[PDB]
Structure 1
């Protein structure tokens, strides 16, 4: 019934907005805190009633120094990149995976691709095209999930709310395990 979630991944990949949406059911359009803190989510996940504490983290450089304090006792990690940022995805196996395996060796990981609303967005496609990039594809996220040993790969959009609910239900399932 009481479970701990930690969410990690590159600066600006949409972690805080994802937690705010899960929690308050509305995307923050103007103000967004660096970290959304102290929130316990009530989740029903079939059978029990879970209280899922949501522990947000950050970088932007020095928030680096505190992040380690987030991992004691976690039950489930959401490890994020954004679908508008091929760069964010390479950081998964390069940075976030070693960091989390180090601090939380056997805790289940859900790999999440955030900003799914941008995958056909015109300005995004233009901006990436100029670098000979394109939005991350679902196949890529699934194979990264495979590679790093994740419990599963999911996509969502905090902006439209599509897929958010399912992220937290699967994380809750994972944490119960």
Structure 2
């Protein structure tokens, strides 16, 4: 097989780790446990090619920024995430994340990932965002920023239900091969 490296970044608690957990095996973690930095290796199968996909999980919390630059190195693909129940997280995608990825991963395929799609139509989520004077991120908005940042793909998923999770990694694995 071919060894490829995937790096995943994005706002703290937007769902990066759960994305990895649910994909590589299962069991959706309910309690939030901030990541400092952690590496995983999953063997993905896409288009007949078997790949040893190294997954470099990073920290979304501001208090751990320090270490991130250490995960970026020899990446074959970068996944920038945001949470669809937090419009602000999408703002940061273009107001922070692209810039950072562009600096440490010059010339590496990007995949914008909207997480927690299961919340898009959650009436409670919706009502709460009303107080903040806003609403769940929409597919249009996602695609838009995806295009603005020059992402080579935009996908949505829900680690909670598993929806779209596999597609995210097949896309990432495929992008890692180009």
Instruction: Report the TM-score when normalising by structure 2.
Output: 0.95
What is the CA distance between 1:35 and its match in structure 2? 5.0
Looking at structure 2, the residues matched to 38 and 71 of structure 1 have their Cα atoms a distance apart, in angstroms, of 12
Distance 1:28 1:54, change over 3 A: same
Give, in whole Å, the separation in 2 of the partners of 1:109 and 1:11: 19
Deviations 1:73-108 (A, max 9, x none): 000011000100110000011100000000001000
CA distance in 1, matches of 2:76, 2:103: 15
Q: For 2:65 and 2:48, how far apart are their aligned partners in 1?
A: 37
Alpha-carbon separation, structure 1, partners of 2:7 and 2:103: 14
What is the Cα deviation at residue 60 of structure 1?
2.2
Task: Look up the SS of the partner of 1:29 in the other structure.
Answer: coil
> In the TM superposition, what are the counterparts of 1:126-141 in structure 2 within 5 Å?
126-141=127-142
Task: Find out whether 1:40 has 2:41 as its counterpart.
Answer: yes
Residue 87 of structure 1 aligns with which residue?
88
Q: CA deviation at 1:113?
A: 0.3
SS of the residue aligned with 2:39?
A: coil
**Distance in 2 (alpha carbons) for counterparts of 1:60 and 1:33:** 7
Question: d(CA) in 2 for partners of 1:165 and 1:26?
Answer: 15
**Structure 2 spans left out of the alignment, 5+ residues:** none
Match of 1:16 in 2: 17
Count of aligned positions: 177
Of 126-135 and 26-35, more deviation after overlay is shown by 26-35
Is residue 2:65 matched to residue 1:64?
yes
- Give 1:107's aligned residue: 108
Partner of 2:167: 166
Q: Distance in 1 between matches of 2:38 and 2:59?
A: 11
> What CA distance in whole angstroms lies between the structure 2 residues aligned with 1:166 and 1:154?
8
Q: Check conservation: 1:108, 1:150, Cα contact below 8 A.
A: yes
Unaligned stretches of 5+ in structure 1? none
Name 1:156's counterpart in structure 2: 157
Q: Is 1:175 aligned with 2:176? A: yes
| RMSD, aligned α-carbons | 1.3
TM-score scaled to structure 1, two decimals? Answer: 0.95
